[PDB]
Design an enzyme around this catalytic site. Sequence first.
Site, PDB file in Angstrom:
ATOM      1  N   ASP A   1       0.835  -1.194   0.000  1.00 14.89           N
ATOM      2  CA  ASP A   1       0.000   0.000   0.000  1.00 14.89           C
ATOM      3  C   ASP A   1       0.876   1.251   0.000  1.00 14.89           C
ATOM      4  O   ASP A   1       1.763   1.400   0.842  1.00 14.89           O
ATOM      5  CB  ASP A   1      -0.873  -0.061   1.252  1.00 14.89           C
ATOM      6  CG  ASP A   1      -1.787   1.119   1.412  1.00 14.89           C
ATOM      7  OD1 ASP A   1      -2.175   1.753   0.405  1.00 14.89           O
ATOM      8  OD2 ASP A   1      -2.147   1.387   2.585  1.00 14.89           O
ATOM      9  N   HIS A   2       0.636   2.142  -0.962  1.00 12.98           N
ATOM     10  CA  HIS A   2       1.342   3.421  -1.032  1.00 12.98           C
ATOM     11  C   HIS A   2       2.858   3.251  -1.072  1.00 12.98           C
ATOM     12  O   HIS A   2       3.599   3.864  -0.301  1.00 12.98           O
ATOM     13  CB  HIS A   2       0.907   4.377   0.078  1.00 12.98           C
ATOM     14  CG  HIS A   2      -0.337   5.124  -0.263  1.00 12.98           C
ATOM     15  ND1 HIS A   2      -1.589   4.557  -0.180  1.00 12.98           N
ATOM     16  CD2 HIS A   2      -0.519   6.372  -0.751  1.00 12.98           C
ATOM     17  CE1 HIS A   2      -2.492   5.436  -0.577  1.00 12.98           C
ATOM     18  NE2 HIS A   2      -1.870   6.547  -0.926  1.00 12.98           N
TER      19      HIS A   2
ATOM     20  N   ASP B   1       2.385   5.268  -5.668  1.00 17.05           N
ATOM     21  CA  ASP B   1       1.685   6.546  -5.585  1.00 17.05           C
ATOM     22  C   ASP B   1       2.613   7.622  -6.124  1.00 17.05           C
ATOM     23  O   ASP B   1       3.506   8.104  -5.420  1.00 17.05           O
ATOM     24  CB  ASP B   1       1.254   6.897  -4.171  1.00 17.05           C
ATOM     25  CG  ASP B   1       0.478   8.200  -4.120  1.00 17.05           C
ATOM     26  OD1 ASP B   1       0.184   8.761  -5.208  1.00 17.05           O
ATOM     27  OD2 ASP B   1       0.162   8.663  -3.004  1.00 17.05           O
TER      28      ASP B   1
ATOM     29  N   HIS C   1      -9.385   4.998  -1.910  1.00 17.41           N
ATOM     30  CA  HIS C   1      -8.548   5.244  -0.747  1.00 17.41           C
ATOM     31  C   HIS C   1      -9.333   5.992   0.320  1.00 17.41           C
ATOM     32  O   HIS C   1     -10.347   6.628   0.044  1.00 17.41           O
ATOM     33  CB  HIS C   1      -7.338   6.089  -1.124  1.00 17.41           C
ATOM     34  CG  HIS C   1      -6.372   5.397  -2.031  1.00 17.41           C
ATOM     35  ND1 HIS C   1      -5.327   6.059  -2.641  1.00 17.41           N
ATOM     36  CD2 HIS C   1      -6.301   4.111  -2.446  1.00 17.41           C
ATOM     37  CE1 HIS C   1      -4.646   5.202  -3.382  1.00 17.41           C
ATOM     38  NE2 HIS C   1      -5.206   4.011  -3.265  1.00 17.41           N
TER      39      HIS C   1
ATOM     40  N   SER D   1     -12.454   4.444   5.268  1.00 15.57           N
ATOM     41  CA  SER D   1     -13.038   4.118   6.562  1.00 15.57           C
ATOM     42  C   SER D   1     -14.303   4.934   6.790  1.00 15.57           C
ATOM     43  O   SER D   1     -14.439   6.063   6.311  1.00 15.57           O
ATOM     44  CB  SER D   1     -12.043   4.356   7.695  1.00 15.57           C
ATOM     45  OG  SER D   1     -11.157   3.258   7.815  1.00 15.57           O
TER      46      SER D   1
ATOM     47  N   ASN E   1      -9.958   0.587   0.467  1.00 15.07           N
ATOM     48  CA  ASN E   1      -8.864   0.609   1.435  1.00 15.07           C
ATOM     49  C   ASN E   1      -9.379   1.015   2.807  1.00 15.07           C
ATOM     50  O   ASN E   1      -9.914   2.113   2.969  1.00 15.07           O
ATOM     51  CB  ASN E   1      -7.806   1.608   0.988  1.00 15.07           C
ATOM     52  CG  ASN E   1      -6.970   1.105  -0.173  1.00 15.07           C
ATOM     53  OD1 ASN E   1      -7.409   0.279  -0.965  1.00 15.07           O
ATOM     54  ND2 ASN E   1      -5.733   1.603  -0.264  1.00 15.07           N
ATOM     55  N   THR E   2      -9.143   0.165   3.810  1.00 13.88           N
ATOM     56  CA  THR E   2      -9.734   0.324   5.137  1.00 13.88           C
ATOM     57  C   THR E   2      -8.677   0.041   6.197  1.00 13.88           C
ATOM     58  O   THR E   2      -8.152  -1.074   6.264  1.00 13.88           O
ATOM     59  CB  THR E   2     -10.926  -0.627   5.275  1.00 13.88           C
ATOM     60  OG1 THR E   2     -11.782  -0.468   4.139  1.00 13.88           O
ATOM     61  CG2 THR E   2     -11.729  -0.334   6.522  1.00 13.88           C
ATOM     62  N   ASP E   3      -8.389   1.037   7.038  1.00 11.56           N
ATOM     63  CA  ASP E   3      -7.347   0.930   8.062  1.00 11.56           C
ATOM     64  C   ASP E   3      -7.812   1.592   9.360  1.00 11.56           C
ATOM     65  O   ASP E   3      -7.866   0.945  10.417  1.00 11.56           O
ATOM     66  CB  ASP E   3      -6.037   1.550   7.528  1.00 11.56           C
ATOM     67  CG  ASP E   3      -4.819   1.301   8.438  1.00 11.56           C
ATOM     68  OD1 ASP E   3      -4.986   0.838   9.582  1.00 11.56           O
ATOM     69  OD2 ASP E   3      -3.675   1.590   7.998  1.00 11.56           O
TER      70      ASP E   3
HETATM   71  O1  LIG Z   1      -6.369   4.461   2.189  1.00  2.72           O
HETATM   72  C1  LIG Z   1      -6.004   3.989   3.266  1.00  2.72           C
HETATM   73  C2  LIG Z   1      -6.964   3.705   4.408  1.00  2.72           C
HETATM   74  O2  LIG Z   1      -7.923   4.753   4.566  1.00  2.72           O
HETATM   75  P1  LIG Z   1      -8.618   5.083   5.999  1.00  2.72           P
HETATM   76  O3  LIG Z   1      -7.657   6.009   6.705  1.00  2.72           O
HETATM   77  O4  LIG Z   1      -8.812   3.745   6.650  1.00  2.72           O
HETATM   78  O5  LIG Z   1      -9.923   5.734   5.614  1.00  2.72           O
HETATM   79  C3  LIG Z   1      -4.695   3.262   3.314  1.00  2.72           C
HETATM   80  O6  LIG Z   1      -4.339   2.806   2.002  1.00  2.72           O
HETATM   81  C4  LIG Z   1      -3.609   4.185   3.881  1.00  2.72           C
HETATM   82  O7  LIG Z   1      -2.675   4.550   2.875  1.00  2.72           O
HETATM   83  C5  LIG Z   1      -2.873   3.492   5.017  1.00  2.72           C
HETATM   84  O8  LIG Z   1      -3.856   3.345   6.025  1.00  2.72           O
HETATM   85  C6  LIG Z   1      -1.706   4.291   5.581  1.00  2.72           C
HETATM   86  O9  LIG Z   1      -1.077   3.487   6.573  1.00  2.72           O
HETATM   87  P2  LIG Z   1       0.270   3.946   7.346  1.00  2.72           P
HETATM   88  O10 LIG Z   1       1.078   4.696   6.317  1.00  2.72           O
HETATM   89  O11 LIG Z   1      -0.144   4.835   8.501  1.00  2.72           O
HETATM   90  O12 LIG Z   1       0.828   2.622   7.815  1.00  2.72           O
HETATM   91 NA    NA Z   2      -3.299   0.839  -2.025  1.00  2.00          NA
HETATM   92 ZN   LIG Z   3      -3.781   8.135  -1.934  1.00  2.00          ZN
HETATM   93 ZN   LIG Z   4      -1.946   9.006  -2.020  1.00  2.00          ZN
END
Ligand SMILES: O=C(COP(=O)(O)O)[C@@H](O)[C@H](O)[C@H](O)COP(=O)(O)O
Ligand code: NA
Ligand SMILES: [Zn+2]
Ligand SMILES: [Zn+2]
EC number: 4.1.2.13
Lengths: 293, 293
Positions: free
Chosen positions: A82-83, A104, A196, A199, A239-241
């Site tokens: 990711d990224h 990215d 992206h 959440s 994408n969900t974190d």
């Molecule tokens: O789009 C993202 C998640 O979105 P969110 O904040 O969950 O709405 C991910 O791809 C972020 O790039 C990722 O959560 C970044 O993680 P860290 O760089 O903090 O590990």
């Molecule tokens: Na990604």
């Molecule tokens: Zn992005």
């Molecule tokens: Zn970006």
Amino acid sequence: MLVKGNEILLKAHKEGYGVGAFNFVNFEMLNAIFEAGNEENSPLFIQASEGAIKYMGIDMAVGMVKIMCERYPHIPVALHLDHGTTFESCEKAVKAGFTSVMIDASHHAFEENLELTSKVVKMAHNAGVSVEAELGRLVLVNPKEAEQFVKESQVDYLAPAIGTSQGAFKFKGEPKLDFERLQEVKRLTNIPLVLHGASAIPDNVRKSYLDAGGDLKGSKGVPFEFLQESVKGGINKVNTDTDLRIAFIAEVRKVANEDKSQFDLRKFFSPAQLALKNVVKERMKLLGSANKI
Amino acid sequence: MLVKGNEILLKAHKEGYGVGAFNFVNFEMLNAIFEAGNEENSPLFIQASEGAIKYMGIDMAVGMVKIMCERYPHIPVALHLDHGTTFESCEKAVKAGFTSVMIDASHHAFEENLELTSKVVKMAHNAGVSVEAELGRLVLVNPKEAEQFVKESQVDYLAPAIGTSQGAFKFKGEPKLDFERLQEVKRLTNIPLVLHGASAIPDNVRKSYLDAGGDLKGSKGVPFEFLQESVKGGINKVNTDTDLRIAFIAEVRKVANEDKSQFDLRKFFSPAQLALKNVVKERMKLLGSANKI
Ligand SMILES: O=C(COP(=O)(O)O)[C@@H](O)[C@H](O)[C@H](O)COP(=O)(O)O
Ligand code: NA
Ligand SMILES: [Zn+2]
Ligand SMILES: [Zn+2]
Ligand SMILES: O=C(COP(=O)(O)O)[C@@H](O)[C@H](O)[C@H](O)COP(=O)(O)O
Ligand code: NA
Ligand SMILES: [Zn+2]
Ligand SMILES: [Zn+2]
């Protein structure tokens, strides 16, 4: 099993559903994500940021996922960088065993973004790895640029900027995304698309967090209805974190508050896993990947 | 690299030093233990209880350790089942790739403890795996029983009961261990010996836990001086868990207290790893395993 990212996302693209792409930083997050996929009969995109890779070590990031895939061999799983911020980072991920990588370069002008993305694609495709790229900034995506960008780069999936941002504080006021831009990108590119910053910060999660003494001053995520609308518009990777982090840490905070004598890590992290797992299960149902194995 | 437990402990036995045997339940604990061993140039016993194995899954317990061993190939590491309760549990650990297993049958009378231990030894030795057993209960060990028990069972290392107990509340009154029984066991058995319940609750760890709002009312560990005396008396494997948990969770509590908006798991667990790592490093120096690679 562990598969190329395109294997999962081409199916989602053609059948019109979204696959959550869930970030992890350690075993507890990964276990909860996999148990959710097992319980909802859903394919899994597992993703690690560059910072998560630094924290775990890329050998452990890949190694833990391979163990989990062997534990649940019937679940389609892609392991995604990711990224990624440089060609070298994407190449390291390919060599370590990731099956999907993102570059990215969206902060660059079209030509430079296209050049760097194409270099990553050539390297990744030669190794049987799928690629994500990003176009637009919070100006938003130019759908005609997206069309040529995909045609020339051969990137497998595209994250077009339509209004999201990362983290818990996405909208100063009311949530709003450019669904007309999304639909035009989808029509012209006809590939899987990526959202992206997806959440939602659901009400139950926010409450759990604040009750445990946490503060989410002015947090606002993407409403469930907007996520469903984005899938209807052609988003296939979501994408969900942040939602996972808040649900997990809420439970850690709760245990710390309610028993000052508690120091068994498992007593903190078993309820945290459960809360994270439940967020993922609900999200898989919402996006339409449940019962798709 | 990953080796039979007896390989590490025969050296400690011959050279008169102790090797900490550090429990883990997840990635963060394991990473901190390995970084400690790397930084102190010390061999490692890494151990997992049956509860830890249930929490991680035995496939993940072994798999994570194998990744860490490949990351630090110059460190001798044994992977040890702590407090196996049945033959079948020990056998599952052997089959999964553990290189040392413990059977605790000390609650049985001598003859039944010896019979079950001997059955475990036969199975484990056939697979190239070392075995620990336990004798005595907090009546303490009968050194003449220990002599016969070791000779007949062929067990590789023995945990003789000399007065410790597990957890943070080891002594209602003054710390007391039976060092005379220890020395007699060592004289009669001439094998590596194991100390259970060997956490010290160091002053700085206690202070960090209390400063973060934790409660350790009535806690008392094994004094550093007693650990050194135990090693002088023939202890070669020193089981340590509670100290690690307290140091780790103190830092988790501290982060929760000082930033109510923090939900990045890495921000809680990086300082927690550091505090755990430092406990392990100091313990390796105290027991004499530092600079023994
Ligand atoms: O789009 C993202 C998640 O979105 P969110 O904040 O969950 O709405 C991910 O791809 C972020 O790039 C990722 O959560 C970044 O993680 P860290 O760089 O903090 O590990
Ligand atoms: Na990604
Ligand atoms: Zn992005
Ligand atoms: Zn970006
Ligand atoms: O002797 C031990 C550690 O002693 P300690 O409490 O750290 O003084 C270990 O062998 C214990 O058996 C182990 O810590 C028990 O772990 P769980 O059963 O709680 O996982
Ligand atoms: Na043990
Ligand atoms: Zn015991
Ligand atoms: Zn014991």
